[PDB]
Structures are given as structure tokens and as C-alpha cells.
């Protein structure tokens, strides 16, 4: 079956969808420890804007608390903790202004 154009276009459009977020990406300062999992799946804005120069960007967001395991790299001891991650609730195709 050929997937209809409207359906194809609808799914690739800029919107919030499940996205993998490395803990190190959300928290650049967490450079020493081991985390399990090393990334989390939360909703983030993504899609190919009709105007190819625009970026799918969040215009709405909230925070979600996730249980993560922190592992001490030297002793290998594990400990559970709650870690906050930004989740996108609304998205729009926006221009990326030229900085500088």
C-alpha cells in the first residue's frame, strides 16, 4: 500500500514527537559519572518545515521528572535519583537569525 501524501506530510510536519536526549546533552556539567540509561526519551520539536530555511522550534514547554540511575565510575555503586528534563508542548517553524 502506498502511504497517501496527506498522511506522509502530516507526520513529517514540525510537531512534538518522541526524541532521545542524552543526559550529557541536557546537563553538560555531568561529565564524570555513568548513567543508566545514558539517554531518555521525551517529547521534542522536530519536523521538516515547508519553508526549508525555517527551524522547527518549541514555543511551549514544561518539565518532566524522570528516575535515572547514577553509577559511580570508580566504585560502580548505583543510586537512583530524579532528574528533570525539558519537554516541548508546542512547536512552530521559526527563522534562525544570523548572529553577529
Cα separation, 12 vs 50, in Å, equals 10
Query: What's phi and psi for 73, nearest 5 deg?
Result: -65, -20
- Asked if 9 is part of the footprint of its own copies (rule: CB under 8 A), the reply reads yes
Residue window 59-88: x/- pattern of binding to its own copies, with contact defined by CB under 8 A: -----xxxxxx----------x-x------
Assess contact for 7 and 27: CB atoms under 8 A. no
Return the range that interacts with its own copies (CB under 8 A); candidates 25-33, 44-52, 92-100.
Answer: 44-52
Partners of 19 in the β-ladder:
42
Q: Which residues bind its own copies (CB under 8 A)?
A: 1-5, 8-9, 11-13, 17-18, 20, 22, 36-41, 46-48, 50, 52, 64-69, 80, 82
Amino acid at each position: 500500500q502506498v502511504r497517501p501524501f496527506l498522511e506522509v506530510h502530516e507526520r513529517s510536519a514540525c510537531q512534538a514527537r518522541e526524541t532521545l536526549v542524552p543526559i550529557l546533552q541536557e546537563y553538560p556539567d555531568e561529565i564524570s559519572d555513568i548513567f543508566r540509561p545514558s539517554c531518555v526519551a521525551v517529547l521534542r520539536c522536530s519536523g521538516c518545515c515547508t519553508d526549508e530555511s525555517l527551524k522547527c522550534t518549541p514555543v511551549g514547554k514544561h518539565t518532566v521528572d524522570i528516575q535515572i540511575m547514577r553509577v559511580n565510575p570508580r566504585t560502580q555503586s548505583s543510586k537512583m535519583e530524579v532528574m528533570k528534563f525539558t519537554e516541548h508542548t508546542a512547536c512552530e517553524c521559526r527563522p534562525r537569525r544570523k548572529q553577529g
